[PDB]
């Protein structure tokens, strides 16, 4: 499903992304915005046999198993299909594991270019939460 901005913000807060390892809610909202426009069903095929799945476009080359990707490391130990759910539980958990690496949110190129070092709080300002 496609979330409303504030709706996703509240959901992400419920799922404990606000201030997770230092990253304020805004960062994740902004990231979701540029990666999939808040669409849980968003997918993107790459030149290799990998696809980006979910609201945070998590790549199947390293993070999930789609049962048909050459070199599946399945870092998140999860079926890529879980990342397309209307329930964001799986996408958040995997994002938390990804961000637990040293590079933090830099794993998301879109976040670096469009959110890193900005007034990210703007992405949640106005929302009733």
């Amino acid at each position, epitope marked *: 499903k496609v979330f409303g901005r504030c709706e996703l913000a509240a959901a992400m807060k419920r799922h404990g992304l606000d201030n997770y390892r230092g990253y304020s809610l805004g960062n994740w909202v902004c990231a979701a915005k540029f990666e999939s426009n808040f669409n849980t069903q968003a997918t993107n095929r790459n030149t290799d046999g990998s696809t980006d799945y979910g609201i945070l476009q998590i790549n199947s080359r390293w993070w999930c198993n789609d049962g048909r990707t050459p070199g599946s*490391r399945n870092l998140c130990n999860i079926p890529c299909s879980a990342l397309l759910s209307s329930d964001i539980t799986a996408s958040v958990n995997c994002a*938390k594991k990804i961000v*637990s*690496d*040293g590079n933090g949110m830099n794993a998301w190129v879109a976040w670096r270019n469009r959110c890193k070092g900005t007034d990210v709080q703007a992405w949640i300002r106005g929302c009733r939460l």
Partner: antibody
Amino acid sequence: EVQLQESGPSLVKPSQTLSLTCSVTGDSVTSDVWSWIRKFPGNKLEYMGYISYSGSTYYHPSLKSRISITRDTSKNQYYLQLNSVTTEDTATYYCASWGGDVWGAGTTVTVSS
Amino acid sequence: MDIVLTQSPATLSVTPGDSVSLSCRASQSISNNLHWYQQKSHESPRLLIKYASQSISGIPSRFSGSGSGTDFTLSINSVETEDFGMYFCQQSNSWPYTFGGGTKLEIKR
């Protein structure tokens, strides 16, 4: 099924170095984030640190200085190194997945002269 | 700065069949980033609930977790004979990760 197993010297002398090995079976060491957790007497647990899929690491600040976590991709093991130990480092040591789903049986390391 | 987790009661004595609730409080808000572990004598810790209330496929249904922020609760609907031992909470919201002092679940007689 993924399984872990700790191994190493059960006795370390003060000022010396404590070394432990965690053998990963069932999956690849490069395919997950792995940790070292120690349990002091009196049920006091301390999350020592973890090494990610890339090889990057995070160490507990109180330990930062004496700790080192590494891995060996061909052997499928990751290690713990703790320098200048003192009787205070006597504890039961466990290796576990970052996700917390798999834990080794744990091994006791005693620091004494 | 390091987040401190306080668990209570330190010890709890119950009869198999009774239900119980264990508390874990954080010195700083941690949202849902609180995990519950069980460790019985001579055994390694076992993850029971992750992220405050998410269940783990394979963990008995009598175990459940609730709470958010700084107050969390592990509930056991009708404790069973194999459920006695230590219970610890751990937060993964900020590094370093930290554990509460644990609560001992013991047999009432």
